[PDB]
């Protein structure tokens, strides 16, 4: 029902399994334990990736007007590399 995502600095993020499958990368490991350990994604990045999961799933349709997803400039370079690593 839930999976645990662990950042390189040791933070554990527990998110709904359906939400984690937003990531093509996580989809491969979880469909192919219920933990995933990201040795190269730090917590300030991983936390924002998890907010993205909530936002993609809530706003998959346009029934509700889709708000913007705010991203601090300081994280955008790593967030982009993380997003590319996770395929989401």
């Amino acid at each position: 029902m839930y999976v645990k995502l662990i950042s390189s600095d040791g933070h554990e993020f527990i998110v709904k399994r359906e939400h984690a499958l937003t990531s093509g990368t996580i989809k491969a490991m979880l469909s192919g334990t219920n933990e995933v350990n990201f040795r190269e994604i730090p917590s300030h990045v991983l936390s924002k990736v998890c907010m993205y999961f909530t936002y993609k799933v809530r706003y998959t349709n346009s029934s509700t007007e889709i708000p913007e997803f705010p991203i601090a400039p300081e994280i955008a370079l790593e967030l982009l590399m993380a997003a590319n690593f996770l395929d989401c």
Partner: protein
């Protein structure tokens, strides 16, 4: 044709926006924009035989529609509304939107209309059909901070992705 290639690229970029609604009717657009804040906009196929695309945008008086002309490899706003010399031309339709968006964000034009018959297009935020990918949301943020993506501390693969969509909206 270089022009054929420029048109196929413009259509690729349009598919990356997340705010291109394809074959949405003029009344479906009126319903979707009815509750949106002033300036909210989207792009969709035109119903008109002579035009490819139309902008739909919420004004304070309700949603309204502006066709985009494409002639000999350049996009510009429908030339029935103003003289063509005041309707800047673009190889890319997303670039066209970006330009007018950036005009409003930079407060060079506002929601009030000009008194001298020049172009009045108030654009604030696009209406997304669906949540964009995280990579693309990151891309938009980087474009909003710099155009010099090739000096960034990124691998060439991710600079190549940034280079595919340099717009801020």
């Amino acid at each position: 044709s270089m022009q054929a290639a420029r048109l196929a690229k413009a259509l690729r970029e349009l598919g990356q926006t997340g705010w291109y609604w394809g074959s949405m009717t003029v009344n479906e657009a009126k319903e979707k924009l009815k509750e949106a804040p002033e300036g909210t906009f989207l792009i969709r196929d035109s119903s008109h035989s002579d035009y490819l695309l139309t902008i739909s945008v919420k004004t304070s008086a309700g949603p309204t529609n502006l066709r985009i002309e494409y002639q000999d490899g350049k996009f510009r706003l429908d030339s029935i509304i103003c003289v063509k010399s005041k309707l800047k031309q673009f190889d890319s339709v997303v670039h066209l939107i970006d330009y007018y968006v950036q005009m409003c964000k930079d407060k060079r034009t506002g929601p009030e209309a000009p008194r001298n018959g020049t172009v009045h297009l108030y654009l604030t935020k696009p209406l997304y059909t669906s949540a964009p990918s995280l990579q693309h949301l990151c891309r938009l943020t980087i474009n909003k901070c710099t155009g010099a993506i090739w000096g960034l501390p990124l691998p060439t693969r991710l600079k190549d992705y940034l280079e595919e969509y340099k717009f801020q909206v």
